[PDB]
């Protein structure tokens, strides 16, 4: 549990809510829409951000948000618009938890060191390395904790109980399951978790409509992470901002209130 995420998580407890938290990589389809993008999920609902730095091969997604790092990519955003932003949308959203998803090689490409400082500076609450597994992160949750940021870690779908365990330990503002609940198991694995004082878990896999959001928070998590779904808007109206924003500002309205 860590600074901003535990507030968070206390107000939506004494709200009887759960948390909505979409993801978007900076920067697609161009810095300043991008910013705009993330300015409408704050005003429309989102209980905190999980964002990405462009990376031109992502192992671990898919064709979609592929598709947004190559976005963001060819729109040419820089790792220092990536940080402008992020530090923009602070001033604007002090106590609005921000969440970074990334890819090992960008971090070490910027230096370990230079890359969290310049997220410290930024104000980023967690960072989360996409492609390295629990037992391999030291060097990464060490540079977490020296500046300030909460090392988050994924409990995979095939999960055993000693890596869990450390997935719990380890481990700080929330947990990310790479699950889902079904709409009307999942159930065992949160209540290994809570056992574990696991901070809270948030199930981020294929959520894409308001149900599962619901179904989400009825099986214990604490909320819905929803990745590819919001991207998925994004691409359709990369070219037409006002539908973009609309559309985009209906989701998360739509995807918020079921919690």
């Not at 978007?24 to 910013?35: A, K, M, R, W």
């Not at 060819?74 to 890819?103: E, N, W």
């Amino acid at each position: 549990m860590s600074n901003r995420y535990q507030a968070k998580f206390a107000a939506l407890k004494a709200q009887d809510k759960g948390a909505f938290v979409p993801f978007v990589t900076i920067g697609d389809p161009s810095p300043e829409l991008s910013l705009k993008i993330i300015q409408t999920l704050v005003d429309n609902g989102a209980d905190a951000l999980e964002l990405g730095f462009p990376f031109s091969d992502p192992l671990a997604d898919g064709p979609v948000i592929q598709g947004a790092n190559l976005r963001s990519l060819a729109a040419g955003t820089t790792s220092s618009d990536c940080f402008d932003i992020i530090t923009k949308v602070r001033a604007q959203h002090p106590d609005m938890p921000i969440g970074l998803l990334l890819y090992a090689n960008l971090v070490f490409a910027n230096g370990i060191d230079e890359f969290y400082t310049k997220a410290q500076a930024a104000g980023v609450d967690s960072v989360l390395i996409a492609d390295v597994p629990v037992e391999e992160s030291a060097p990464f949750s060490k540079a977490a904790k020296a500046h300030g940021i909460a090392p988050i870690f994924i409990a995979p779908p095939n999960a055993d109980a000693d890596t869990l365990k450390m997935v719990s330990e380890q481990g700080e503002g929330y947990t990310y399951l790479l699950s889902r609940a079904g709409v009307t198991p999942i159930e065992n694995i949160l209540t290994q978790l809570a056992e574990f004082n696991a901070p809270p878990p948030l199930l981020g896999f294929g959520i894409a409509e308001p149900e599962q959001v619901r179904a989400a928070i009825k099986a214990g998590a604490a909320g819905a992470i929803s990745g590819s779904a919001v991207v998925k808007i994004i691409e359709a109206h990369q070219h037409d901002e006002a539908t973009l924003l609309a559309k985009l500002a209906e989701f998360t309205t739509a995807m918020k209130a079921a919690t």
